[PDB]
Design a protein around this nucleic acid. Structure first.
Lengths: 78, 144, 70, 208
RNA sequence: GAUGUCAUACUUAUC
């Protein structure tokens, strides 16, 4: 309920960059970025877990027009 | 040409495939032959510019229906149907003030676009495949 | 290999009663999975916040007593 | 005899410093009191490892040396690199002929410039506190941000030029913040154009 | 990660 899935991000984006992008709408408690350890590249998706479900829903509904490196980033509930 | 043997910052040799160290150069060449090294090796624009624009005079007839506009266009002699699209009034050639409405414009290739402003928010659908029709036998275009 | 599983402490059965009595094949693996998303989602059902005091907590009754004592 | 971690966490006033290995020691209460002290330093994490804290950075690339500005502002590094480049091209006969009749004046830069760099141009290094210990991954963990402020890298990646005018300098997610309202996780957050003046608060955010 | 034979290199102003 408090975890939102962010997709549509490029491989060049980093986890402190994603944390600084997500902190503009609310403090995120944790940020998990699944990446392959064999190649060292991200999969283009991440999970941001906030402190509450209402703040996560507000961050998912307020980040519907975010563009990173020319690619639109989508936020969904998970 | 071994892609695994590299030089460290201490003047030694390092095998990143097996992650081994060698002090002298004579031990790095003897480390390629062995069991662990063999195990590590086995484990690892044109249509827009050519469009003619003479801008003829269009003939649109609107009618308030209840449950639709009819645009009379000449013969285009092509299979390309005229397309309708709803846009905003924020983009213009001179940008007039107090422009906060929407306009549905129908455009064709040999003819100019005809635009009608809609003050309402949503009263119909401006989709092309849903509620539009173009009779090529009589060359009659309609959209509701 | 058996030597890499015997030297690193692998192939050792450990029971975690917090996340539905799950199984863990290592003490270091269980310590790494304690500060993870699965253990946090298991602890959020009981109402305990994700803090540093419940790192070595395994039983649900001991975690509930540690949450009620603070 | 040896109690579990739950009794050691409930008996001690600070259960955050209690570990799983401290329950099987000879004094759990004394270890819990010493680990939760005011100025105590924790034990390093390499005491339970098996690589002796020196076998992790085997194949990792590392720079040879990081020279400071006071040492690089004297012109000795370029002269040393030129001498190393000139000495690497000499053969054994050129090295043996230079030992009987050497050529004096190798660089001969200055004599008071090094004293001025070591006494007048002395710069203090970036030290640390005594509690901040060192580990194997401490040199690579540099990720350890504020609401209402954006860095240059995030502004270059998102394509948002930071300006004093609040027309386009806020991100385009501010329209959703104006339609839905302020974020519930930060009641004291003030954004220009909604709850703050636009020419006054030119930092695109204020935590008051 | 350990074992037991061989080789290389390093340290304590050792002689």
């Amino acid at each position: 309920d408090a975890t939102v899935y962010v997709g549509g991000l490029d491989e060049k984006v980093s986890e402190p960059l994603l944390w600084e992008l997500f902190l503009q709408a609310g403090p995120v408690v944790n940020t998990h970025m699944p990446k392959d350890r064999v190649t060292g590249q991200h999969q283009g998706y991440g999970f941001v877990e906030f402190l509450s479900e209402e703040d996560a829903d507000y961050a998912i509904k307020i980040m519907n027009m975010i563009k990173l490196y020319g690619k639109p980033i989508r936020v969904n509930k998970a | 040409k071994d892609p695994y043997f590299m030089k460290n910052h201490l003047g030694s040799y390092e095998c990143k495939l097996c992650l081994t160290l060698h002090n002298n150069e004579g031990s790095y060449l003897a480390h390629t032959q062995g069991k662990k090294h063999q195990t590590n090796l086995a484990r690892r624009v044109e249509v827009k510019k050519f469009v003619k624009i003479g801008r003829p005079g269009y003939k649109v007839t609107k009618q308030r229906d209840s449950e639709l506009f009819q645009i009379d266009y000449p013969e285009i002699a092509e299979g390309i149907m005229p397309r309708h699209r709803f846009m905003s009034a924020y983009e213009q050639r001179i940008e007039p003030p107090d422009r906060r409405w929407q306009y549905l414009l129908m455009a064709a290739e040999p003819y100019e676009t005809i635009a009608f402003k809609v003050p309402s928010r949503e009263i119909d659908k401006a989709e092309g495949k849903f509620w539009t029709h173009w009779n090529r036998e009589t060359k009659q275009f309609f959209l509701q | 290999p058996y030597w890499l599983y015997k030297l690193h402490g692998l192939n050792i059965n450990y029971n975690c009663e917090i996340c539905g009595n799950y199984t863990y094949r290592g003490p270091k693996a269980f310590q790494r999975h304690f500060a993870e998303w699965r253990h946090a989602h298991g602890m959020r059902c009981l109402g305990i916040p994700n803090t540093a005091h419940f790192a070595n907590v395994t039983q649900i009754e001991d975690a509930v007593s540690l949450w009620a004592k603070l | 005899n040896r109690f579990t971690v739950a009794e050691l966490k409930q008996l001690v006033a600070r259960p955050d410093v209690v570990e799983m290995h401290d329950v099987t020691a000879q004094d759990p209460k004394l270890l819990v009191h010493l680990k939760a002290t005011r100025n105590s330093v924790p034990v390093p994490r390499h005491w339970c490892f098996k690589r002796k804290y020196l076998q992790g950075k085997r194949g990792i690339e590392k720079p040879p040396f990081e020279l400071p500005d006071f040492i690089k502002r004297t012109g000795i590094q370029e002269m040393r690199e030129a001498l190393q480049e000139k000495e690497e091209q000499k053969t054994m006969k050129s090295k043996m002929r230079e030992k009987v009749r050497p050529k004096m004046g190798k660089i001969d830069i200055d004599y008071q410039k090094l004293h001025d760099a070591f006494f007048k141009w002395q710069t203090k290094p970036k030290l640390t506190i005594h509690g901040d210990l060192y580990y194997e991954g401490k040199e690579f963990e540099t990720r350890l941000k504020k609401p209402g402020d954006l860095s240059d890298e995030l502004r270059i990646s998102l394509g948002m030029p930071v300006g004093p005018n609040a027309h386009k300098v806020p991100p385009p997610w501010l329209i959703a913040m104006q339609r839905y309202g302020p974020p519930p996780s930060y009641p004291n957050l003030k954004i220009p154009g909604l709850n703050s003046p636009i020419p006054e608060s030119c930092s695109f955010g204020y935590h008051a």
